[PDB]
Symmetry: D3
Subunit: 237 residues, 6 copies
Amino acid sequence: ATPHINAEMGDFADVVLMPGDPLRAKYIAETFLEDAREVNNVRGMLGFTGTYKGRKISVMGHGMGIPSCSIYTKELITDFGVKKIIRVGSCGAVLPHVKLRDVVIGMGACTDSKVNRIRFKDHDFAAIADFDMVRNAVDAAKALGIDARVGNLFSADLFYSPDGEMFDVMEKYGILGVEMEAAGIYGVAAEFGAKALTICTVSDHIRTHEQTTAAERQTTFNDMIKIALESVLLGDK
Amino acid sequence: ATPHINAEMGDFADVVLMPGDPLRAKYIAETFLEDAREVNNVRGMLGFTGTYKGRKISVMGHGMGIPSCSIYTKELITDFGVKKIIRVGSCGAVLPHVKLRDVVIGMGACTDSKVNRIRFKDHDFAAIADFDMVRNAVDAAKALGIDARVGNLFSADLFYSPDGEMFDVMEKYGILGVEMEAAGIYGVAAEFGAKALTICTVSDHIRTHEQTTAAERQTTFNDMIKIALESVLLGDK
Amino acid sequence: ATPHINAEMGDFADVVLMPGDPLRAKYIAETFLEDAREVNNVRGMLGFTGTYKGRKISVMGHGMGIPSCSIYTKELITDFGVKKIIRVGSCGAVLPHVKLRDVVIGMGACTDSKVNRIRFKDHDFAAIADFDMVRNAVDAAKALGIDARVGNLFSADLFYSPDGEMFDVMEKYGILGVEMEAAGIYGVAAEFGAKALTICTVSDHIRTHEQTTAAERQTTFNDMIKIALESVLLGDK
Amino acid sequence: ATPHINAEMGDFADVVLMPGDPLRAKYIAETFLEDAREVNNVRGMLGFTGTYKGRKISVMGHGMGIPSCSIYTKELITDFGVKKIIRVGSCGAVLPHVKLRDVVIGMGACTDSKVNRIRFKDHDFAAIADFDMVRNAVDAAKALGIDARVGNLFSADLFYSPDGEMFDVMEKYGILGVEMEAAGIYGVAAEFGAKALTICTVSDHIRTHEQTTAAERQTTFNDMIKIALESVLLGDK
Amino acid sequence: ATPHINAEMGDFADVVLMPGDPLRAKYIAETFLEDAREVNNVRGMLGFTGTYKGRKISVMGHGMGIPSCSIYTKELITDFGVKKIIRVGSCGAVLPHVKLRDVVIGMGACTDSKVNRIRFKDHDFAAIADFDMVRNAVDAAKALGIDARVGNLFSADLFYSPDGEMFDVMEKYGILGVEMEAAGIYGVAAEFGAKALTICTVSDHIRTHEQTTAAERQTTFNDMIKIALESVLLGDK
Amino acid sequence: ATPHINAEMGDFADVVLMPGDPLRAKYIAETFLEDAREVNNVRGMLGFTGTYKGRKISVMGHGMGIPSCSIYTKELITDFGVKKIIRVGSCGAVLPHVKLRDVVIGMGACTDSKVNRIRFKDHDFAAIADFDMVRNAVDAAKALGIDARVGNLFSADLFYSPDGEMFDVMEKYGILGVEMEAAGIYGVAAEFGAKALTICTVSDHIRTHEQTTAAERQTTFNDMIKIALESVLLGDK
Ligand SMILES: CNc1ncnc2c([C@@H]3O[C@H](CO)[C@@H](O)[C@H]3O)n[nH]c12
Ligand SMILES: CNc1ncnc2c([C@@H]3O[C@H](CO)[C@@H](O)[C@H]3O)n[nH]c12
Ligand SMILES: C[n+]1cnc2c([C@@H]3O[C@H](CO)[C@@H](O)[C@H]3O)n[nH]c2c1N
Ligand SMILES: C[n+]1cnc2c([C@@H]3O[C@H](CO)[C@@H](O)[C@H]3O)n[nH]c2c1N
Ligand SMILES: C[n+]1cnc2c([C@@H]3O[C@H](CO)[C@@H](O)[C@H]3O)n[nH]c2c1N
């Protein structure tokens, strides 16, 4: 066990799906996994392990922000033998052609956090996903008839940023979605030699002011989860 | 009422105690307050309001890391009229004479986060607590016969820091505890015009490697809670 | 014509292969393209246009370093209608298992240049390639039976860096090759709305000290050229 | 002796009051101390040692700016055994409701200087005063019927800053006064293990351009000196 | 030989003139040198060695940008024994009193590149020319009837900069000309113990929008080369 | 008058010599100038105006550090019509062949201060002296038979720097002397449109540990003073 995860080696599968909300992790375990059992509840950050189409899968919340998800992902890798992490979250869009409920895959993640500069001698570390994991997700999405855009995400430290101008810069550079964790997960994956991918569903649009309701959530949330789970099966080959 | 808090104006008292762990907030509510009622459960980040010696007080978790706590403290201040925030957390110690379970009060908070540089045109913003709140905490600790050191905390973005050398620098400069939120809360308090204070209980010693369990952190660091609650009464006059 | 390219709209194909060495561009034009004609010679930066299996394609040098290649790629995009740029370069390796003449595909590019910070409000811009172009290159490589690793490159401003320790950091983070332009080309592609990809052939090993001669770099790194050209045909389909 | 102070161990008391102006130090020595003797005059930076209500005390100018006062305070601490340093100076106000003659106590000090980043591995060091010294000054002021605000000062490197908008940022974040030394003295105190405090009199208002009368400066200047001296007696017990 | 220069010790004189355009290097060798021999052609970066008034002198292009010229100047110094480097290039002017065709001598070079910060522990390194070389070029110009202006150049990384405001800052601070290499060459010269100088002819004016005629380009280019060559003879005395 | 200089337009000559020590300014006025009159004594920062061989000249202290001298030089330029400023100071040497009492002229000045980054959009501003003034000082030294090296100075914010390794870097890059003001004076001169020069006499050797006394620094570094004064006369003709 660790100070944040009260479990032991073996309680987690080698692949873990991670939404930011622990309550969504419970929803995933009960809705998509069979024989799911709770393997962690320290700080209410619920984690479960079950099977999907016979394959052992774990799902656990990671909390909001780079510092929060960096703790859980590092521990899962070094203390629980996890090889692959797939964040399945929500994000806001800044591009006019990116619509509410669209699925976006972060091949890369920009950030205003200082964590990768601390790791990389203050130079620019391109926080990227594992290529095969990205391709697997794109193919699974295609199989399910869901188009997914692949590109850069922006992982913000401040949900309430005092710099309103940054959103225009993000739009100019083609950022597909604004969230708060991808760059941190990719930094941890690179630091400890694991593989990661972040998939998000657009839950709010910064330009149109649109927002998903309770219902709109579960529906598009389900598509992203199916993409993630099926992408794992393609990955096993 | 807000994106991360499902409650309405009036559900929260004007003073809110905030541990990072929502289960610690639950324990505090069940053990130190009378007639506590749950006022938030979005994302499992439990928040409660009850009374302490007749005084209305709230307690709610803020999650781990500057990004997470910045969201919750900003929302409490701008949408729930919260005036004072007392963070009651845990921290790792680097100084040889600071022991496990000692209580430290952060009059200031250093950080390796970039959030205050973003707010302060890339200059050095001294993230500090409200002086009267610090004094009330010191006086309450004295009345309770509990030792408490007052000084600088260090708010890290990375619990698992790749820069071990930084701990030697922290020790040289007299840092009392290493945690992950104080500088962020102090930044939000100055940005939106409220008052804050961070009190921590040492949960680990970075040099000796001694540490407390997840269960101990969740429910046994009570000296700091008594100090926090009694300091509020002093502040009321 | 632009200030660095004496050619007219229509002289370049919509896709341009770009080595840093104009003499390598000449070699490519003479041996892989049919009916190639020279379309630029300003500053000796030779550019050509011809056909590959019936497909119109251009090849032009970009010089060494981010500043040099940023000028040429910007002009090709804004003034010559170029849509896709495939850099075909060389790089030094730091990983023990990467060998001389291995082909590496840069899905992302780290850098110690300040150009992307100037573009991105001093935050971390993840300089990435276009996903479809990366996938097309990976598929073309498999079809040709050529191994190719996909990952991060490091675009350095100083070939003769005084910071020897940075190579250990690169190694630790899995950097596939050290070169000098990828991050700059990806920055320009994002700023002006085009698509880019960098493929490199390992020309030196920074740890073992093995290296190829200038003649070898100029005319014998052909696997990457075959991959690049075939990846274009895949993209047209 | 050092290249900056022509004196020997023993010439200075364990507590030193330091105005920026050496002529102000002479004024304090002749007006508030008894049996005052000049102990330094190198570079005209006058320093005196005498007694106040039987307590041995020294008073010496520190010059203008962080680099100047960092030299004097460091030497006093390491070569003359000084334990406590109290800077007594002037500052400009940016807050509309802070008025001339007001006394401000710098519990913390922001800065645009690079000195603390050099000490603290380029992270944010919260330059803070010693808590007991702050408390002692607050109590002394109250005993004298003088009200005093406690908060953040901003220590500027450029009195004639080309960045006028920074004053608006300072105002937004509640900076009580703009001066040029506090952050530097607090950094030295922490580096060499001593205790420090900065007390300032608002000598001018940056917005109203209203400067305090050279007539009313002397009376309040005296208020500040009294608070400082009396605060030292409280600290002794 | 090196990967960038196919020549051997002895092939280059102790003094090398360097325009950015290799074709300009060929022109100089053919027009001003006696018995010029081509000594390098790798990557088309033409280098020649001949004599001027009996003095052995080399001329070779350096390519565009700091990273390109940093490679060549470093190698010339450490592997070919070059002692003095004189860059002869073009620059854009921002000052109203600096005119098209004026000759500017960069006694210093500002830059937005990160290379000198990498060399100088992230502090400000003043990239300067060798004083005697500056003096010799001023005197040579006077003897030829030309009044060169001596001052700061600005070496940009981005010819197509997204920061339009920087030109106004350059003007305010007296920058004589904008080019892309001087600061890099001065950094290499200081790093490896050689002497350097950059002389430029104003080829375009950012404010008046003037542009040098192809005819004006050749006549002025010639005056600059004469100044450079004659300055070398003064330095030998 | 200003809050730092109690004088009016006309009290200062158009050329001002400035040592950091006001007592050295007094010694210079009493020894080299005829009919010197005191024109400022605020904060004990003595300034005088007199004649040298019939030429009106002023001499005034500027205090220690960039912040201190930036105040005085700015005021002299804007409020007192000063056109040229010659700093005559002391510095520590790091090079083996630079000896105590050697005279060095700072053609340029590196720095670890943030003031020029604040002025120059966080890029590298090369803080340089006026070329003609440098030439006049070199010629004056020659005529007087005094040796003088011309090169880079390093202007430090911390006399007692915690980064000892920086001296090795300075030595590697050819720094002639370590002082604390040149870069700041050069920045002010460029910002307000005046001309400046820094000449220093080596007062300590950082490697051999040899050093001069406070008394020697105050009154015996006269060679640099003769060079400075005679350089002004050369500049007038
Ligand atoms: C502008 N819109 C948005 N901005 C920033 N983060 C988010 C998010 C995600 O949801 C949580 C914040 O509510 C975080 O965990 C983040 O990843 N959704 N919509 C967002
Ligand atoms: C605003 N005007 C200008 N801006 C930047 N560089 C240049 C140059 C020089 O010419 C080449 C770029 O065309 C570079 O090698 C550079 O030194 N000339 N005019 C310039
Ligand atoms: C190095 N370190 C960093 N943070 C903490 C903490 C605090 O507890 C949570 C992480 O365990 C965070 O919310 C942080 O503030 N406790 N002990 C810590 C330690 N040793
Ligand atoms: C350390 N290092 C840096 N760049 C390169 C390169 C590439 O080839 C040119 C320099 O040789 C540049 O254009 C760069 O991209 N090849 N081998 C390299 C090496 N070992
Ligand atoms: C390391 N170091 C730094 N500054 C100085 C100085 C100069 O003299 C004063 C400090 O002694 C400052 O004004 C500074 O310019 N002299 N010798 C120095 C030395 N060895």
